[PDB]
Design a protein around this ligand. Structure first.
Ligand SMILES: Nc1c(F)c(=O)[nH]c(=O)n1[C@@H]1O[C@H](COP(=O)(O)O)[C@@H](O)[C@H]1O
Ligand SMILES: Nc1c(F)c(=O)[nH]c(=O)n1[C@@H]1O[C@H](COP(=O)(O)O)[C@@H](O)[C@H]1O
Lengths: 322, 328
């Protein structure tokens, strides 16, 4: 209805942050949650069961509402599903008051087969009920006919607000990701521009055209396609993934595309510098500089307090910049 | 001298299959919603001829997910298992294509995008398709074009190579070539795996980055091919009977010629024949290698949307083989 641009602006006004909470639970995370709950009389699962919107998830809700001691003896084949989903609900419940957006990386939800995709659907359902803007980090790329399937999965099935896209194959893929001609629907995406892996320079900086590094060429082509699609008129956008640890490029991108939406992962687990990243990418509409924090919250044993201190530190830095 | 099904590296598996059936046809299995619905319609209209044939195949008993449902009478599904109907007809469409066409296929390539848009149900189908192909011992590619940082991509490695037991996958290395360390190698288990990295793709605007970007008069696609091979060497893949090869579009005749000229012994996967209208003669000629498992020609919709996929697959197999014989 409102469109992602508007969702972001309105939630920014309500919670006054640009923290994007990453929800990438790994097998160890799920196993640790199960073990801790088991040894703590399921105190967090019990809290989960008291939240109202658990009642609105799509898949196997009745299983999720069962008492953990009954799951383990009467629905044991659903034990992994139940604890994985409950870990996600627990992180969301503990941290959502500090989050402008949640980003879920698809890779974490696929490796067990179908079960994690049901979890992923329920996570999207839950965030939707909470009116929290969402990003599916799936780095999708293919030819037009094929990518329409991702459009359906991400924007119709999950009802995500946005996704990440790798446009190395070409930009025209965005016509079949960010736009549905038959339905007249428009969607938002962040394209990979400068990534956090240690060898990201190999293609992103070392290749060039004219006198511009590849990452600039790619940012500019993504913006040309946004214009072509008239996304911003429809309250949607194509934005950029720029690594936290990539200060020069962040500085360059914010200077040269002054009003672009940036998503910046790499603080916490990957050691990026929060002050420098937020200052180089700063915009007064700070929804345009999403600071993603995943593992530094999810692998923190006190995730509410972890999210709070990122929120508070972001706030202090936002204030310094103005 | 004999190695059992599943106990050899992908280089050896491809080589043996290529010796067996003498082709480089790669059949693509990309079932769309219309395909599944049309299969269900056609089977309902013909008393489920093809499903009953799937049900007599021995290896259907060896698939992992919901065998109880898959092995039911189709009229029982429709009347008593309404919520499993889509799963059943989707999975049976895939088994039908496999059953009708496998004798002509050097490899099957499944594009992950077609298996995700309904949520979990298609991933169960996909897992059964991979289990089925593993039992048939047909070489497999999962076309997922994966890319992420190392910690995250490990999860795709587990899905593709442990859960699906795929032989290979497609990979976009624009983020960096170091992700390959976490895709083609598992340091915990000391296992090696094969992949095809995107080099030149078939989309109409593929030149915009792959050709326009360059370093010192070498275009991006050449740099990216070299970097991938550099990483294959470092990882010792070919000494472990695995490889990193290249996706080069059927319609990219000059780039195919360049790649085969400059990397004489590389493995090439080439989509774009059939529905995308690539030139098969030109593609095969420019990509030719006498070990023709090194020039896989993928055909998807031209087979899977034909009402007689066995005959369509035979026609492409025969056309390819005729062009292979011309080269020699
Ligand atoms: N999409 C990403 C990029 F393009 C990138 O350049 N670097 C990234 O880390 N991510 C993702 O951002 C998240 C980083 O999570 P955390 O380190 O735990 O805080 C993971 O989902 C990564 O896969
Ligand atoms: N992986 C691909 C590439 F890198 C590429 O450059 N072009 C492609 O078509 N594919 C895939 O190859 C198949 C083409 O299928 P068919 O057209 O029905 O014969 C689909 O899965 C495509 O997504």
């Amino acid at each position: 209805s409102m469109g992602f641009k508007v969702k972001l602006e309105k939630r920014r006004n309500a919670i006054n942050t640009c923290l994007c909470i990453g929800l990438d639970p790994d097998e160890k995370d799920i196993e640790n949650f199960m073990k801790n709950e088991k040894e703590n009389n399921y105190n967090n699962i019990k809290k989960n069961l008291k939240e109202k919107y658990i009642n609105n998830v799509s898949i196997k809700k009745d299983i999720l509402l069962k008492a953990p001691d009954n799951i383990i003896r009467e629905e044991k084949s659903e034990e992994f599903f139940y604890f994985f989903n409950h870990f996600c609900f627990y992180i969301i419940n503990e941290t959502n008051k500090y989050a402008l957006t949640f980003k879920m990386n698809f890779a974490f939800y696929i490796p067990y087969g179908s079960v994690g995709i049901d979890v992923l659907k329920n996570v999207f359902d839950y965030l939707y009920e909470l009116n929290i803007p969402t990003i599916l980090d799936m780095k999708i790329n293919d030819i037009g006919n094929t990518v329409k399937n991702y459009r359906k999965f991400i924007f119709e099935y999950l009802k995500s607000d946005s996704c990440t896209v790798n446009i190395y194959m070409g930009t025209n893929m965005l016509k079949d990701i960010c736009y549905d001609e038959e339905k007249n629907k428009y969607y938002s995406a962040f394209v990979l521009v400068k990534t956090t892996n240690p060898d990201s320079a190999i293609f992103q900086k070392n290749l060039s055209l004219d006198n511009k590094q590849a990452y600039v060429i790619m940012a500019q082509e993504a913006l040309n396609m946004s214009s072509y699609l008239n996304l911003e008129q429809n309250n949607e956008f194509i934005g950029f993934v720029v690594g936290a640890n990539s200060y020069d490029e962040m500085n360059y991108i914010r200077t040269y595309f002054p009003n672009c939406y940036i998503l910046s992962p790499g603080i916490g687990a990957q050691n990026g510098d929060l002050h420098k990243t937020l200052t180089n990418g700063y915009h007064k509409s700070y929804e345009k500089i999403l600071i993603n924090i995943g593992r530094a919250i999810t692998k923190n044993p006190y995730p509410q307090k972890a999210a709070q201190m990122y929120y508070d530190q972001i706030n202090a830095i936002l204030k310094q910049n103005m």
